């Protein structure tokens, strides 16, 4: 409503720049990384990389080069922003107070000037005489360096040649020289102009121009020995130096476009090339010193490289916009040591309310082709490490207190392959040890601290009651025919040790192990529990068991052992763990199966009849549960590959994720070196930690090796529809097998209505839990999945996966043919319901009030679903330049356009047609579109911007949609969608970008906007930004056609940075306001409570 909030959910994760030099000090070889808005610095150490500084800029980073001018101690760094904010920055830091220092800055944007196709190019001279900029066609800007050019005053020099591919400086010339490839009608050619500062003009370069490749795309500046300039084509690679010509054309490079290279040997002998087919190459140069020959090896296969820098000793950092960033080690093949989760160009996403919780989850379609994937982002909690000792294969963990007098515990017991260890935990130093009464040669099924000052250690052998005060054994209970124990579960006074089918009940009185009951079971015993429910004395009246062979949860009355409720769970999957614990007040049950899928029941101790049932799959490997007393209440730490914590708040259940790869077993330990902490184990190590009250994000990549396009969730089918697109070169054959080849069941669309490397489109049924591809549908020849739908249509209450596709043929560059298909997945098989032929591509589909709305080219169209199981068109609307995005609320419909900004097309039912209610007449090329409520609307401008319209209220002019918010974000936003990743503001809108930045948006009342607005400008006073760049400049709406300050939008990150500034400088921000220091600090954190 009128005024809005913009804060980051996830930072950009994609690298469109990396650069390597002595940045922090003369000998620390830094790797510096450019992710769009952010600049990361790292020391190279023999083992891994050391993060020294990650900083945020006000502007997208377009140029980044290190350089050292004569006299200066260490390399200085240039940056330039897409808004052309140049800056030269030094890095100085005393102690640990870390500083980034501006030595120079200046915006160099020439108000007009046609901005060059290949885009901004920043190069710097070998001798540091000047800094050259090809920004705009026909114009070469020249930022000088030979005197204190602090304001970075530059002059232009006209450039006769206007279409230019790439330009670099060159080595060993007596005057700064540029070597560029340019294009007239005679193809692409290479040329040299020397550069003069006094003349302020280009003169004649050392050698004359030479013809080069039609697709010559790149210029490598060969250093001092040899000299010259290497030019990377697609067919061939040429070298020119002035007296020599040398050209090779290996068959191993023509496949794909070599996009990024880097000098490996500082004498320019080895060069790492790299292409979009992920392939790392080696350019070798051969050695009165001249060049002798060129040579290229194929080194291996990598994430598709945007930028690369070779560190030291075979190590290479790989920048990728297109997938997961890598760090690879050269070996024939190439082994990636490390790999960095970049959410590739986030092409689509969905909020999923799984676990029907107060919290949703995000699944994207991230990356393209070989890096193509989904991604699962959601909120979670890591643990504060203290000890992570490496004890492989711990089948169990129990805490005990060695001294009966102590109210602290100083014993931890661990199950193994056949025997049982003992861990002393010497205050703050864990060590192995012995224990009398407790065997270290039998496999422990249970132990703890029981009643009448006694101990217990149930092993496979027998129940063996121990007196704690003197040690030793006061009782031992074994099956009469001398047999082992099945499923052990005990508390502090009672035991019911299972054997095979039978059940042998026990009680732990003083110095005696008593029995009361023995009974057979229908089937062998699966899992047991009694945990002190109701207490009343410290006792159980029930027993929680499951079976095998039937898979049945059985609550029994204890002494009588009679069946009250024999629950049936079905399936060939059998119960794993079971527990009984009280939340808030109510009595719940929790049965964890072998596959994760957990049941939680409503229970009463008098009856036991299980009421209200649910099924919250919290993992995939067997899930063993454990109660742990989290301060005021007890929580449940489940154990699978998708570990979870469970507690309740306010009479409904919460399912908090844990940020760990897998936790096998767990038990609540409150020592003194580790008071109320955790004891956790996985396949390799044993870890001790504490809950992280700061709730970060968890991401789970799910590789696809092809292009993900759309994603919507079907609740009844409990799975995902995913639109895929694998490349195949000309019958064809795919290059690498993707997720659409390795399905279980497949299909190829049959339709006959529509009668050298092609895209093949599949619809992917992906299970919501396993994340495997249940079904893959191959669409027709050259059919293009562009829209996707999960919903039910008509009165027909069957859910459908509906896809809108087009027919792609080389001749036409706009589709005149496409179809809308209705699919159905249930009973494990992909049914096809209905067809529909239309005269072009469908770019958008969304359910509308019981109807299917779809954007067929320059037409927005509405469909009803005939009882005849076909689609009927109710009304059309022809006036659009290109209907790309649809979003709905009520009878209103938003329409984004290729350039017409946004129409709030409406629908009045009484006649059933399309009334144009209100349009925006700003000429905006659109990326994404969304309704916050019936009054305000957010859209994404092609030039990385966010505006909000509004309806205007006294005449017929009201059809003009009034802009009420302007904002520059910096991220090209590919999609919005409602929802929140938690549980001061209203509503919750999430967006996915190309740079992998995930963004929250929400709404505010004037009282806030004003209060927060001054605070921002008050921060920009106190804050020293990186390149000395203003905020409300970086936030001012900018295209070519307009520039206007940020109004109607608060930057949450600017507000959030407040908790990272120094103490008195906060009081400075207050000064006056309209509100004392500590009122602010709370609500800032309270605004963290939304993202």
């Amino acid at each position: 409503m009128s005024y809005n909030y913009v804060v980051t959910a996830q930072k950009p994760t994609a690298v469109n720049g990396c650069v390597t030099g002595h940045f922090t000090s003369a000998e620390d070889l830094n790797l510096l990384i450019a992710k769009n808005t952010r600049l990361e610095i790292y020391v190279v150490t023999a083992e891994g990389l050391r993060p020294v500084k990650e900083v945020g800029m006000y502007g997208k980073i377009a140029v980044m080069e290190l350089f050292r001018p004569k006299g200066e101690s260490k390399d200085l760094l240039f940056i330039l922003t897409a808004k052309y904010n140049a800056c030269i920055l030094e890095y100085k830091q005393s102690g640990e107070s870390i500083d980034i220092i501006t030595r120079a800055h200046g915006n160099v944007q020439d108000r007009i000037g046609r901005p060059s196709e290949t885009g901004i190019i920043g190069i710097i001279d070998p001798e540091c005489r000047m800094i050259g900029l090809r920004l705009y066609d026909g114009l070469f800007k020249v930022i000088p360096l030979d005197r204190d050019n602090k304001e970075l005053k530059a002059f232009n020099i006209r450039l006769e040649e206007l279409h230019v591919i790439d330009v670099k400086f060159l080595y060993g010339c007596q005057a700064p020289t540029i070597c560029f490839v340019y294009q007239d009608p005679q193809g692409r050619h290479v040329k040299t102009y020397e550069v003069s500062l006094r003349e302020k003009e280009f003169n004649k370069g050392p050698w004359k121009q030479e013809n080069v490749e039609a697709e010559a795309s790149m210029v490598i500046a060969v250093p001092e020995p040899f000299g010259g300039a290497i030019i990377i084509g697609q067919e061939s690679i040429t070298y020119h130096n002035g007296d020599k010509y040398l050209a090779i054309a290996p068959p191993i490079i023509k496949q794909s476009t070599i996009v990024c290279h880097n000098r490996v040997d500082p004498n320019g002998s080895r060069y790492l090339l790299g292409d979009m087919e992920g392939r790392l190459f080696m350019l070798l140069l051969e050695k009165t010193v001249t060049l002798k020959d060129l040579r290229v090896e194929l080194l291996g296969e990598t994430s598709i490289a945007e930028c690369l820098t070779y560190l030291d000793n075979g190590v290479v950092f790989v920048g990728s916009r297109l997938g997961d960033s890598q760090l690879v080690k050269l070996n024939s093949y190439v082994v990636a040591m490390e790999t960095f989760t970049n959410l590739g160009p986030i092409v689509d996403m969905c909020v999923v309310d799984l676990e029907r919780q107060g919290q949703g989850q995000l699944v994207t379609c991230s990356g393209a082709f070989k890096e193509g994937s989904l991604r699962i982002i959601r909120n979670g909690i890591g643990i504060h490490e203290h000890a992570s000792i490496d004890l492989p294969g711990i089948k169990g963990l129990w805490p005990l207190r060695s001294d009966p007098n102590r109210e602290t515990d100083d014993t931890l017991v661990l199950s193994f392959v056949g025997q049982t260890r003992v861990l002393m935990l010497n205050g703050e130093e864990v060590e192995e040890t012995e224990l009398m009464g407790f065997v270290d040669d039998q496999q422990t099924f249970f132990c703890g601290n029981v009643a009448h000052q006694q101990l217990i250690q149930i092993t496979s052998a027998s129940v063996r009651l121990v007196s704690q005060e003197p040690k030793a054994l006061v009782s031992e209970w074994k099956e009469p025919q001398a047999k082992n124990i099945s499923v052990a579960s005990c508390n502090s006074s009672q035991v019911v040790v299972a054997v095979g089918r039978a059940l042998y009940y026990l009680q732990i009185h003083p110095q005696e192990l008593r029995q009361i009951s023995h009974t057979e079971m229908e089937h062998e015993v699966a899992c047991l529990d009694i945990t002190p429910l109701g207490d009343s004395n410290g006792l159980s009246p029930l027993c929680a068991i499951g079976l095998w062979t039937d898979i049945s949860a059985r609550i029994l009355k204890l002494p009588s052992f009679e069946l009250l409720h024999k629950e049936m769970l079905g399936g060939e999957i059998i119960p794993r763990s079971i527990l009984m614990t009280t939340f808030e007040s109510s009595h719940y049950l929790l049965c964890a199966l072998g596959d994760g899928a957990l049941f939680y029941f409503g229970l009463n101790i008098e009856t036991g009849l299980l009421s209200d049932r649910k099924k919250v799959t919290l993992g995939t490997q067997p899930t063993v549960l454990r109660t742990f007393r989290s301060l005021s209440t007890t929580n449940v730490f489940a154990c699978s590959d998708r570990p979870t914590v469970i507690y309740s708040s306010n009479h409904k259940l919460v399912f908090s994720n844990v940020n760990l790869k897998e936790v096998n077993y767990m038990c609540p330990l409150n020592s003194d070196g580790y008071p109320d902490s955790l004891a956790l184990a996985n396949n390799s190590t044993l870890t001790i930690g504490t809950i992280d009250e700061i709730q970060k994000l968890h991401i789970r990549t799910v590789p696809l090796y092809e292009s993900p396009r759309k994603i919507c969730y079907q609740e009844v089918s409990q799975c995902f529809g995913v639109l895929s697109s694998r490349i195949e070169v000309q019958g064809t054959t795919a290059l690498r097998p993707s997720a659409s080849t390795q399905a279980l069941s497949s299909s190829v669309s049959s339709s006959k209505l529509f009668s050298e490397e092609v895209e093949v489109h599949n619809l992917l049924i992906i299970d919501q839990h396993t994340f495997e591809v249940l079904h893959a549908h191959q669409f027709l020849q050259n059919e293009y999945a562009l829209s996707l739908v999960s919903c039910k249509l008509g009165k027909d209450p069957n859910t459908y996966f509906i896809v809108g596709t087009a027919m792609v043929y080389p001749e036409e560059a706009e589709p005149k043919q496409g179809r809308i298909v209705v699919f159905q997945y249930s009973d494990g098989k992909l049914q096809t319901v209905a067809e529909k032929e239309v005269k072009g591509a469908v770019y958008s589909m969304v359910e509308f009030n019981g109807k299917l709305l779809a954007s067929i080219n320059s037409t927005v169209r509405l469909y009803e679903w005939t009882t005849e199981k076909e689609l009927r068109t109710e009304c059309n609307h022809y006036n659009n330049i290109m209907a790309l995005y649809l979003k709905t609320k009520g009878d209103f419909i938003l329409v984004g356009d290729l350039m017409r900004s946004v129409l709030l097309l409406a629908y009045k039912p009484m006649e059933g047609n399309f009334e144009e209610i209100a349009r925006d007449f700003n000429p905006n090329w659109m990326s994404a579109v969304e309704i916050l409520d019936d009054d305000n609307f957010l859209g994404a401008e092609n030039a990385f911007n966010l505006f909000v319209c509004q309806k205007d209220s006294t005449d017929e002019e009201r059809q003009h949609l009034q802009e009420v918010g302007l904002f520059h974000l910096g991220e090209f936003v590919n999609v919005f969608c409602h929802g929140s990743l938690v549980m001061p503001t209203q509503g919750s809108v999430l967006f996915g970008t190309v740079n992998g930045m995930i963004g929250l948006v929400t709404s505010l009342s004037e009282s806030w906007y004003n209060l927060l607005l001054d605070m921002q400008n008050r921060l920009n006073k106190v804050i020293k930004s990186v390149g000395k760049i203003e905020h409300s400049f970086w936030r001012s709406f900018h295209t070519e056609r307009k520039t206007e300050p940020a109004t109607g939008f608060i930057d949450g990150d600017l507000i959030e940075s407040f908790l990272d500034i120094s103490r008195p400088k906060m009081q400075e921000v207050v000064a006056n306001l309209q509100a004392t220091a500590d009122d602010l600090i709370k609500v800032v954190e309270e605004l963290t409570r939304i993202h």
Partner: protein, 365 residues
């Protein structure tokens, strides 16, 4: 179209570059929008049009009938077809109505509330758009052929006025002034226009077959005279330094302001280095220009290629500023085309011709 979209979503190719790249694709397949109409008011063939610099919603038109028509170009009918209506018009009833042919009408750069009008009634008139009254009226010894203000900045408020008098006349809007004159041309000046790029640079096209570029801050001498043979020709004085073989009557700067287009009576277009005056020898071939008055023609912007729309007979010929290659000749007018004016927001174009009918040209598909 689809590959454009799948690149942009993935962030393969720069988004705003793909727009530029996309936009030249539209200018190419631009045709006479038949579903649009400019309302007929002008009784004379249209000598000028001008579309607003900020948002380009309203338009001014000039006519030989001494009329200034003001148009809305938007649509808000629930239909895809519409007729540009005139919001206002300075018609014959009006107290200040232009007495004779209206040759330029220009929106005040950096103020939509005002605009300007010069005619063959030897006046220049300043206008309040919102009230429709007048503000200032100037008067000249000779028939006005062209007038302009720089769309660079508001550091100056000079209006270049190019009458039949060889003296070029600069009129300060701030105060009456009008005393400031530029001297050097010898015959009727037929076109004036400022550099988009440069604040105080003015170009001047007289009938004496030469062109000049003036720093108006300089109290004597122009900066350069466009010489078509680039010095190569050993020409005797006062015949040397002549841009066109005949009277020069058309002038428009290149989007960035790095070049200049002179079209003269000799049927040539020439592209010129706006700095040193270097004839770039970009051909265009013969461009029929046989007008006795100014030739009003525009240039495309915000597209990769830069096109130039010069009125050719009963058509608007479309060239490629830097290639010289003609794309086509927009055909819809039955009589000779006087002016054409390019719309940057939807790569559109409006032609005012002697057929007394302003026509709309949009790209197709």
């Amino acid at each position: 179209m689809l590959g454009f979209l799948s690149a942009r979503q993935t962030g393969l190719e720069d988004p705003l570059r793909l727009r530029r790249a996309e936009s030249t694709r539209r200018v190419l397949g631009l045709e006479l929008n038949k579903d649009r109409d400019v309302e007929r008011i002008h009784g004379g063939g249209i000598n000028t049009l001008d579309i607003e610099p900020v948002e380009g919603r309203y338009m001014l038109s000039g006519g030989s009938d001494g009329v200034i028509v003001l148009y809305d170009l938007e649509n808000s009918s629930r239909q895809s077809y519409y007729t540009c209506k005139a919001v206002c018009s300075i018609g014959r009833d009006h107290p200040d109505v232009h007495r004779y042919s209206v040759e330029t009408v220009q929106w005040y750069p950096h103020d939509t509330g005002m605009f300007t009008s010069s005619s063959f009634d030897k006046t220049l008139k300043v206008w309040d758009t919102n009230t429709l009254q007048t503000a200032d009226v100037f008067n000249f010894e000779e028939t006005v052929y062209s007038h302009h203000m720089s769309p660079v900045s508001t550091k100056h408020c000079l209006v270049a006025v190019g009458t039949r008098g060889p003296k070029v006349q600069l009129c300060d809007l701030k105060s009456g002034s009008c005393s400031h004159i530029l001297q050097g041309h010898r015959q009727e000046i037929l076109a004036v226009s400022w550099s988009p790029r440069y604040d105080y640079i003015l170009a001047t096209a007289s009938a004496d077959s030469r062109v000049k570029l003036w720093d108006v801050r300089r109290a004597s001498g122009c900066l350069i005279t466009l010489d078509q043979h680039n010095g190569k020709k050993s020409q005797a004085v006062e015949s040397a330094n002549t841009a066109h073989n005949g009277k020069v009557n058309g002038l428009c700067f290149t989007s960035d302001g790095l070049h200049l287009l002179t079209v003269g009576t000799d049927n040539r277009m020439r592209l010129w280095n706006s700095s040193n005056g270097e004839n770039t020898l970009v051909n265009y071939g013969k461009v029929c220009n046989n007008s006795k008055k100014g030739l009003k023609f525009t240039v495309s912007c915000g597209c990769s290629s830069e096109f130039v729309f010069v009125p050719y007979g009963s058509t608007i010929a479309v060239y490629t500023v830097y290639s010289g290659e003609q794309i086509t000749m927009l055909k819809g007018h039955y009589k000779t085309v006087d002016c054409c004016v390019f719309q940057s927001n939807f790569q559109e174009l409006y032609s005012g011709s002697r057929d007394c009918n302003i026509l709309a040209w949009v790209p197709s598909l």
